[PDB]
Every structure is written in structure tokens, then in C-alpha cells.
Design an enzyme around this catalytic site. Structure first.
Site, short mmCIF file in Angstrom:
data_model
loop_
_atom_site.label_atom_id
_atom_site.label_comp_id
_atom_site.label_asym_id
_atom_site.label_seq_id
_atom_site.Cartn_x
_atom_site.Cartn_y
_atom_site.Cartn_z
CB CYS A 38 -1.01 0.04 1.24
SG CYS A 38 -1.87 1.57 1.37
N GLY A 44 27.37 20.52 -21.92
CA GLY A 44 26.32 21.64 -22.76
C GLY A 44 26.03 22.67 -21.96
N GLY A 83 23.02 23.38 -20.68
CA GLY A 83 21.82 22.53 -19.89
C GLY A 83 22.22 22.32 -18.75
CB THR A 126 21.20 26.81 -18.08
OG1 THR A 126 21.05 25.75 -18.52
CG2 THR A 126 22.10 27.74 -18.67
CB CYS A 152 20.42 -14.52 7.55
SG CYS A 152 21.87 -14.49 8.68
CE1 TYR A 169 17.21 -17.29 -18.68
CE2 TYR A 169 15.12 -18.52 -19.85
CZ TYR A 169 15.87 -18.29 -18.54
OH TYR A 169 15.39 -18.16 -17.34
ZN LIG Z 1 20.92 -16.28 9.76
ZN LIG Z 2 -3.24 1.44 3.35
#
Ligand SMILES: [Zn+2]
Ligand SMILES: [Zn+2]
Ligand SMILES: [Cl-]
Ligand SMILES: [Cl-]
Length: 1040
Positions: free
Chosen positions: A10, A102, A104, A107, A559, A789
């Protein structure tokens, strides 16, 4: 969406949220129960649930306020480079402006100072030269309001000008200060006490000269002296210092990275301000390499009369360069030299006084690398391939890195435009030239065409027009692109052909920056999976709402001490109680922060089912923060692979995501229930990883009975002039008689290219390595851009792949046996094949010479098998002379078939085809008989287990190695002296316990049947929810 719930997804409260709302950009229903709100910020403010969406709402308002302010003052809209910088400015982040030189860049700092001065925040603009200070001083005063007060200081102003600056500095009545870099060094104590909110340095090199200047800048933004010295001690030690979270420093912006920083001091910014003052290496180049087969002076003159200007000639030695200089002086040419006098001749070349400039090739030479003038340098001509001495015997090999540097003087991103360059090599030695081509392919992926292929008129126009576009005010089309991968190794491979210009430490992850012709490109690695199934709640982490199963996911925690992984929100490791935990929650938050800065985001995870799950996990998390999210799949980690992936950019395929979920849930439900029963019996946890593991373990257990029962008598017969023959039983006759001899000619086709299963079996058997070790080597080769792959079930070879074989065969002079074969037409992936026409022996030479160093001998041996197997499939059939001979031994007839002669060489150049001594229609005396016992049914090997899984329809390319290795790690299977797998006594009892009670759930027929259904789910043929019901009905039965 796949109807799943993700923890910490969220965007308003950081709690649990469903993927349907995340895909729509909505927060969780607790924050906002409404489905279609006009404005999310107003809805949360209405219900007073606004917790973290306030920060996002301010960010977009602040960026627009900065964007509108930029348009009102400068009169031009924000560029692509400045769009990324503006979003980092409003977030209070320090960064290096990764961009070509440049106006830009300078500036933007002026506008940021004015924008901060409007709200009252002080800024300090630092410039290298006094002239630049004056120019920016008058440029700011024209555009700034009378309320904004700007003061500067330099050694050329009058005492009255100096006195008003000193008065204001002590009064602290200022908004923007524009002083030189020398002022920082001579007044570092007074500047250390004052604190600024924004510091802009136009030239980092001036600061790097004095070590105190680096410390002074850190104190300007509010970093205490104690933190700076303690971090420097940690950096000198080797560890990485951790910036305290209570410290809120100002914004420090480095205008240009110049690849100059070589000391250890610049690393302070990485740990204290989370940004790296980069060593800018711009791998971006647009060069056409052309090789002229001769080294005749006459053909050089004809070429020079086409280019006519802006030409560099690199000679191998000074003596040869002098020879060319005088020859080009006899004929009327404006030619110069760079060995007796460099500065004058280069200046004459720069101003147009001299058309052709001759130099001597040298690594990091002044003309080879030192000069930077793509405006003038258009054509680079090499009088002989640049060569270097290797080893004590002074081996003469091409120096590709010098060639890359010298040719790079004619092409770079100039004023935002990647200008075109032409590189011409005069070389007569074919061996030297072919060696140069392979090195250039390996390092830069740049090809060298012959003289006939080149069109000089087009190249000259391409050179002139590209510089024409750089000289004019170009319309901004640059974009910032974010590439998200899962493997750090892939990210490091990407940076080699994209450029490791700068790095930003963003929480867990490190975001690299690079400059391309399209703008900035950001890329980072998530270091594995981000989400995983939770353990508690529902059916082993799977809830059931409205008759449908909703998986519940939480961020993965690893871990760093013991490597144990878990999903629960914990402060310490469940195993070793260590607090050093790599929490993917910080990884996800960092991705969300970066998503606000980038214009578009591409999730380039591996192109398989598991990679699709990772991509959707990241995609749904970033959707509430950005909308420009798309999915690309790279089948090879190269420039070509990256280009092809973007050409076929798509969205997330939910069929693949659903396939991963049903496969994960099946393992979770079967594994946990079986492990729970086995834990009560044998006192160990996780004794069942899934259904497939038990089926394979069954095969190994059953093989013991079959191996023993198939014990039969055999005799080895050696013949006077012939082969060794295996014949059943004890042989008492001392002669073998041939009763029928049939000889004929045949054409032998090669075997298809490697798949995952076939590569694992053959490489493991030949190299005496476990399948898991081979698989890890295959992954290493793919992620480093050497093979396609490695997780594939198809033998398909594309036209590009067939071209790779043809290019290699032409290189070695054996193109008369080239036979391009597509093999399969179906499949989402190609077969496992090399991506460049470079064999293992060539690769090993490159490793020995230091061009690359990321491959070991096992990597080369695996690559050799892949290379030879692939090119065998792309080679002509071998015509052979074979004979079928029927022999009578002890009154019983036996058939022998063998090849006795090779009539036309074909694919056997790469995969040898053994021939046998010829037979004759006569009687053969037996020299000696060896009596032994052989089992008709052999014991399983790691290679043959993968073969059995493939032909029995269980397992996947992503799981073949894992299934075998888990049996070893659980203590179920051991290897004998001959690397044959056998069940341990513990492994037998585990399978015996499972067979008596749960054989129906782990039998091969059930395993294959569920695999077929889940394959159809991947193809969209079987329903996702219906499959989960099928598993739920099965597990409910076995829980009794
Ligand atoms: Zn551990
Ligand atoms: Zn929420
Ligand atoms: Cl194709
Ligand atoms: Cl798979």
C-alpha cells in the site's frame, strides 16, 4: 492482476494491499474503500487516513512548480536530462549530473539556486574559472528578482566589489553565492561553519586537487567533521560506512564526471551522500570500421582525397610515421605530425590550418586518448593494426583497447548528438586482422567491414550531417530509462556495454547511471526474488475468498551471515539470531523512490515463468507510483540482446504468472503436508520439497533391485585384426566366423543443438561434473553474455544464430561445410548456443591476455561443448562408409554395425566421429577372452536422471538440476567411485514411508498429469482457479 495480496504494497500506509488495487494505482481498502476516486489525495484527506501519500502529492506539485518556474524564467521546457535532475532536487538527493557537456548543465544549477532562493533557501554555486563566475553572475542578475540577492567573489574585482561581498557573507544576508574553486581552498574554515541547502560544482577536477576541498563541501551541506573522518577511516579500511538516518544534509551536485578521480577521497560522497563522483567512461559510439586489404601509399592518398579534412593517421612506430609524413608532404597535402611538436600541430589541426594529423599509436597516448575534439576529428586511419607485446617471448598481438581509444576520438555524444565516426585500418596480415575482429566483437560488439562493403560517399555525408545536428540547437527528445533486473551479474554485464558512469546508493540496491544517444539509462539489480508465499494463515499461506484462492505474499528476507531465507517480518534471523538481514522491503521501497525519477521503467527479468512472477511483483508494486511500466525479455546479455528485447517490448503475461503460482502452491501444499508427517517420523524438517522429488527418489530406489537382478554373464572378445566385441555368456569357441558382410555408404546428420536437459546430461557425463554445477556454469555464461538463455526446451536456431556459425566458419576457412539449420520451429526460446563467433580456444587466449577475466577452466570446457555442439548442428552432413556384419559366436548369430571410413568431412570437425577397423567375410581367431559380469540395467547417473525426467514428462528446464541436487542435500542419494547415484539407507526409508501411505499423491502418473495441466495454464488452456481447486481437493484427502 492475479488476485493476490502483497504485504507492504500500500502506497499510503505501507500495509497489505491486493494486486487489483495496486494495478489501478489505489491504496488498500482500509485507506480508501472507494474504487473510482477523482483524486486520491483528496479522498485520503477527506477520510483523514492520509499518512504517506502526502509525500507523493507534494513531490509531484514540487516538480511541476519547478517545471513551471523553469519555463517562465528560461523560456524553454525542461529537457530529458533536467527532468531526472529536477525530481532528484525536490527529493533532497545529491547526485552527479550524468550527461554530456552542454549549457543545460550549468543553467540547471542557476535555476535550482533561483528556485531555492524564492523559498528562502541559500545556495552556493562554485565554478572553476573566474570568467565563468562573471558570466553566470550577470546571467543570474538579469533573470532574478530584486528580492533575490546574489553576491560573488574573485581576485579580479575591485576592492569595493570585494568589500560588499565580505560584508554580506558575515551578515548572512544572501541567497546565492557564486565564488570560484580557489575561494573554497583559501577560505575553507569560514565556509565550513556556514551551512547551505544546495551546492553546485561546475568542475569536480579543481575540487579533487585539494583533499581539504572535498571535506569542506561535505561540511557545507551539514555533515559534521566527526562523521567525515570516521567514514574516511572506514573507507581506507575497506568497509562501507553507514550514514546515520538522523542526518539530513543539503543537495550537492557535481556537474561533470571527467574520469579523473583516482584517489580514495571521492568515495566519501558514496557513503555520506549516497552518490558516486563517477569516472565517466562513455561507451556510446557510432563508428564504421573499414579494413583495406593492402598497405599501399597510393590507396592512402585516394582515401585522403575523399575525406579531405579532419583526418588522424595512427602509425605503429615513430619511424613509420615519419615515412608517411614525408610521403604526404611530397604530394600536396596539409599534413602535420605529433611527435616532435604536439601542442602547435594539434592547434593548427583544430583551427583548420592542417587537414591531416599523423601520430604514433600508444595506449593512453596523447593523440590516441588524451585529445577530445570530435568536432574536428572525423576519420581515423591506422597504418597497420595497433599491436602490443604479450608475455616474455614478446608475442605480437593486436591491441584492441588502443584501437578502441584511438578510433573513439571520432565518435562520442557531442552536444547531445552521437556524432558519426569512420575508422579505417590498412592491414595485409589476415591473421592479425581476424584476431582484431574477434577482440572488437568481444569488447565493443563492433564489426569491421571490408573495403568493398563500404560506401565512402554515404559515410562522409553521415559524418558531416551528424556534426551538423550537434552544432544546431537540437530539439530535446532525451528520456530517462530505468532497467530492473534480478541478477547483480547481469547488471555488471550491462554496465560494460552501457557504461558505469555513476552510482547511487538507494537503500539496499545500487542504481547505476549511463549515457546513451537516447538519454540517461538507469539499471539496478534486486538480488533475487522480492516476494514469496507466507507460511501462516489460510491453507499454508493461501487464503480462500469468495470461493477463490488468494495467495498472500511478503517480502523476502535473507540473512547475510548464514544465508537462511524467510518471509516473516523479523528483526533477527530465525536460525542464527543475526541482525544482518537483507530485507527486500527496503529493495521495494528503493524501486518506488527511483520510479518517480525515471520517465519509463522496463523490467528485464529472465524470460521464463519464474522471471515473469518477479516482473509482476515489481510491476504491481511500482504501478501506484508510476504508469510507464513495461516488460522486456533479454535472451542474451549483449547490446544486440538489449536492442531485440526493446524491439519486442510488451506487458506482463498473466498466464505465465498464474503458472508460477500453481506450481508454487503445489509444492507448498504437497511439501508442507509430507514434510509435517516426515518430521514426526524422522525428526527433520523440509524432508519433502515437492511431488517431483519423491518420484525421482523412487526411481533411484527401484533401480537397486533392477540393477541387481539384471546381472548377466559377459565375455570380451578381442580379435586378431578387428574390434573388441561384447557378447553375452561364456564363449568357448576360439574363433568367430562372419556369415554375412553388408557394406554401404550413408550420410550422417548431426545431433540437434543443446537444450537444457540435453546440455545438462552430455556436459555432466563428459566433464565429470554434477548437473547443478553445470547449471550454475550455464547461468554464469548466459548472464555474462557468452551464450543464449540456458533455460530452454527448444532446439530452434534463428537466422541470427545461423549467421554466427557462418561467420566463424568463414573465419577459419571451412565455410564449405556450412549448413544453416533452423531445427525446431516452435519454442519461446532458442537453443543453448554461443552468441559470438568465438570458440573456446580464442576465449582462453583472451582470458590469458587479460581482455576478460570472469571465466574459469570449467566455464571454458562447458563453453567448448556448447560451441562445438551448436556448430555441429550448423555443419554439413558427413558421408561415411559403414558395414553391417553378422557373426556366429558359439553357434548363435550376433549383429555388429560400425562406420569404417569417412568419405566427406562434415560436422565431425567439431564432434569427432569414430571409425572402426574393417571386417571381412572370413573367420577370425580370438587373441584373448576377458570374462566379467555386467548388469543389463545400469545404475542411474546424474546425467541419466535428467534424461529420464525429460522423456517421462516430469520436471522443467528450471528445475532439472534442482531436483537431482536436493536428493543429495537431504541425505537421500550418494555417489560412488564411478559417479553413479545410489539411495542411502535414510533415503530408502523416506521413500518406503511415503509409498505405504501417499504413493498415489507422488506416483509418476500423477506428477506427469499435474505437469501437463500446469503447462496448459501457462499457455492459457486450463483455468488458473480451476487448477487450484484440483490441488485443494487432493490435499484435503491426504490431510486425514
Ligand atoms: Zn542467519
Ligand atoms: Zn493502506
Ligand atoms: Cl528468425
Ligand atoms: Cl521452466
Amino acid at each position: 492482476a492475479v488476485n493476490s495480496k502483497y504485504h507492504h504494497s500500500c502506497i499510503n500506509c505501507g500495509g497489505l494491499n491486493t494486486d487489483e488495487r495496486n494495478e489501478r494505482g489505489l491504496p488498500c481498502e482500509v485507506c480508501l474503500p472507494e474504487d473510482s476516486p477523482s483524486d486520491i489525495y483528496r479522498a485520503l484527506l477527506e477520510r483523514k487516513t492520509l499518512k504517506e501519500y502526502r509525500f507523493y502529492h507534494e513531490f509531484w506539485n514540487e516538480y511541476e512548480d519547478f517545471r513551471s518556474f523553469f519555463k517562465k524564467k528560461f523560456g524553454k521546457d525542461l529537457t530529458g536530462y533536467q527532468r531526472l535532475w529536477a525530481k532528484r532536487i525536490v527529493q533532497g538527493k545529491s547526485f552527479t549530473m550524468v550527461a554530456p557537456t552542454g549549457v543545460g548543465k550549468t543553467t540547471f544549477g542557476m535555476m535550482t539556486a533561483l528556485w531555492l532562493a524564492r523559498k528562502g533557501k541559500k545556495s552556493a554555486l562554485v565554478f572553476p574559472t573566474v570568467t565563468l563566475v562573471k558570466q553566470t553572475l550577470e546571467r543570474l542578475q538579469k533573470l532574478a528578482d530584486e528580492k533575490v540577492k546574489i553576491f560573488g567573489f574573485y581576485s579580479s574585482m575591485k576592492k569595493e566589489e570585494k568589500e560588499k561581498f565580505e560584508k554580506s557573507f558575515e551578515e548572512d544576508d544572501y541567497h546565492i553565492l557564486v565564488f570560484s574553486t580557489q575561494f573554497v581552498s583559501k577560505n575553507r574554515e569560514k565556509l565550513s561553519q556556514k551551512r547551505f541547502d544546495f551546492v553546485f560544482v561546475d568542475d569536480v577536477d579543481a575540487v579533487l586537487k585539494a583533499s581539504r576541498n572535498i571535506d569542506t563541501l561535505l561540511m557545507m551541506v551539514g555533515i559534521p567533521e566527526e562523521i567525515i573522518r570516521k567514514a574516511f577511516s572506514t573507507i581506507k579500511q575497506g568497509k562501507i560506512y553507514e550514514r546515520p538516518k538522523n542526518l539530513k544534509p543539503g543537495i550537492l551536485v557535481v556537474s561533470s564526471a571527467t574520469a579523473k578521480p583516482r584517489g580514495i577521497r571521492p568515495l566519501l560522497f558514496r557513503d555520506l551522500l549516497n552518490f558516486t563522483v563517477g569516472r565517466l567512461v562513455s561507451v556510446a559510439r557510432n563508428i564504421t570500421h573499414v579494413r583495406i586489404s593492402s598497405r599501399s601509399k597510393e590507396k592512402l592518398v585516394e582515401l585522403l582525397e575523399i575525406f579531405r579534412d579532419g583526418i588522424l593517421i595512427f602509425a605503429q612506430t615513430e619511424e613509420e610515421g615519419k615515412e608517411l609524413y614525408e610521403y604526404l608532404k611530397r604530394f600536396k597535402f596539409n599534413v602535420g605530425e605529433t611527435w616532435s611538436e604536439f601542442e602547435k600541430n594539434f592547434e593548427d589541426f583544430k583551427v583548420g590550418k592542417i587537414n591531416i594529423l599523423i601520430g604514433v599509436q600508444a595506449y593512453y597516448g596523447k593523440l590516441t586518448r588524451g585529445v577530445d575534439l570530435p568536432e574536428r576529428i572525423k576519420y581515423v586511419i591506422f597504418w597497420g593494426t595497433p599491436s602490443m607485446r604479450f608475455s616474455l617471448e614478446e608475442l605480437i598481438i593486436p591491441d584492441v583497447y588502443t584501437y578502441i581509444q584511438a578510433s573513439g576520438r571520432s565518435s562520442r555524444i557531442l552536444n547531445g548528438v552521437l556524432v558519426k565516426g569512420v575508422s579505417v585500418i590498412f592491414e595485409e596480415d589476415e591473421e592479425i586482422f581476424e584476431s582484431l575482429k574477434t577482440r572488437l566483437l568481444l569488447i565493443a560488439e563492433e564489426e569491421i567491414i571490408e573495403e568493398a562493403e563500404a560506401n565512402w560517399k554515404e559515410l562522409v555525408h553521415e559524418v558531416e550531417e551528424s556534426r551538423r545536428r550537434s552544432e544546431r540547437e537540437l530539439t530535446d527528445t532525451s528520456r530517462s530509462l530505468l532497467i530492473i533486473v534480478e541478477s547483480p551479474t547481469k547488471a555488471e554485464t550491462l554496465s560494460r556495454f552501457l557504461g558505469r558512469a555513476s552510482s547511487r546508493k538507494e537503500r539496499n540496491i545500487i542504481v547505476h547511471e549511463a549515457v546513451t544517444g537516447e538519454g540517461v539509462i538507469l539499471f539496478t539489480a534486486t538480488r533475487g526474488h522480492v516476494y514469496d508465499l507466507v507460511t501462516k494463515g489460510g491453507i499454508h499461506g493461501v487464503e480462500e475468498e469468495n470461493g477463490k484462492f488468494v495467495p498472500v505474499y511478503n517480502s523476502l528476507k535473507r540473512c547475510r551471515d548464514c544465508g537462511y531465507q524467510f518471509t516473516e517480518d523479523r528483526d533477527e534471523c530465525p536460525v542464527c539470531s543475526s541482525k544482518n538481514i537483507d530485507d527486500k522491503t527496503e529493495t521495494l521501497r528503493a524501486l518506488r523512490e527511483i520510479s518517480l525519477e525515471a520517465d519509463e521503467i522496463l523490467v528485464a527479468t529472465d524470460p521464463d515463468v519464474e522471471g515473469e512472477k518477479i516482473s509482476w511483483d515489481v510491476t504491481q508494486y511500482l504501478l501506484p507510483s508510476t504508469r510507464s511500466l513495461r516488460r522486456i525479455e533479454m535472451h542474451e546479455i549483449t547490446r544486440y540482446g538489449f536492442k531485440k528485447a526493446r524491439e519486442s517490448v510488451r506487458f506482463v503475461d498473466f498466464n505465465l504468472v498464474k503458472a508460477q503460482i500453481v506450481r508454487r502452491v503445489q509444492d507448498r501444499w504437497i511439501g508442507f503436508e509430507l514434510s509435517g508427517k516426515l518430521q514426526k517420523r524422522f525428526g527433520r524438517s523440509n524432508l519433502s520439497a515437492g511431488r517431483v522429488q519423491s518420484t525421482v527418489l523412487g526411481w533411484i530406489v527401484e533401480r537397486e533391485e533392477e540393477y541387481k537382478k539384471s546381472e548377466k554373464d559377459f565375455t570380451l572378445l578381442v580379435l586378431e585384426n578387428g574390434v573388441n566385441l561384447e557378447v553375452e555368456g561364456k564363449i568357448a569357441d576360439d574363433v568367430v566366423t562372419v556369415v554375412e558382410l553388408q557394406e554401404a555408404e550413408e550420410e550422417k546428420n548431426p545431433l540437434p543443438p543443446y537444450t537444457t536437459s540435453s546440455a545438462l546430461s552430455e556436459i555432466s557425463q563428459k566433464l565429470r561434473l554434477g548437473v547443478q554445477e553445470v547449471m550454475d556454469i550455464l547461468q554464469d555464461l548466459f548472464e555474462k553474455g557468452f551464450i543464449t538463455y540456458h533455460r530452454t526446451d527448444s532446439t530452434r536456431i534463428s537466422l541470427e544464430g545461423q549467421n554466427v556459425a557462418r561467420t566463424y566458419l568463414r573465419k577459419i576457412g571451412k565455410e564449405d561445410i556450412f549448413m544453416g539449420r533452423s531445427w525446431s520451429t516452435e519454442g519461446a526460446h532458442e537453443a543453448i548456443r554461443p552468441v559470438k563467433p568465438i570458440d573456446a580456444r580464442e576465449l582462453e587466449e583472451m582470458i590469458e591476455e587479460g581482455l576478460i577475466a570472469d571465466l574459469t577452466k570449467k566455464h571454458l570446457r562447458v563453453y567448448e561443448l556448447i560451441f562445438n555442439r551448436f556448430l555441429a548442428s550448423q555443419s554439413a552432413a558427413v558421408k561415411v562408409k559403414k558395414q553391417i556384419v553378422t557373426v556366429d559366436v558359439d553357434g548363435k548369430r550376433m549383429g555388429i554395425e560400425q562406420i569404417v571410413e569417412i568419405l566427406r568431412d562434415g560436422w565431425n570437425l567439431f564432434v569427432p566421429l569414430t571409425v572402426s577397423p574393417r571386417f571381412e567375410h572370413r573367420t577370425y581367431k580370438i587373441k584373448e577372452k576377458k570374462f566379467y559380469k555386467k548388469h543389463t540395467v545400469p545404475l542411474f547417473t546424474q546425467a541419466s536422471i535428467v534424461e529420464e525426467m525429460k522423456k517421462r514428462g516430469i520436471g522443467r528446464p528450471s528445475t532439472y538440476a534442482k531436483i537431482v541436487e536436493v536428493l543429495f542435500r537431504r541425505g537421500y542419494v550418494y555417489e560412488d567411485k564411478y559417479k553413479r547415484v545410489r539411495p542411502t539407507r535414510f533415503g530408502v526409508m523416506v521413500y518406503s514411508y511415503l509409498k505405504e501411505r501417499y504413493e498415489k499423491y507422488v506416483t509418476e502418473e500423477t506428477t506427469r498429469r499435474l505437469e501437463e495441466i500446469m503447462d496448459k495454464v501457462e499457455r492459457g488452456e486450463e483455468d488458473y482457479q480451476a487448477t487450484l481447486r484440483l490441488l485443494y481437493e487432493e490435499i484435503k484427502s491426504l490431510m486425514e
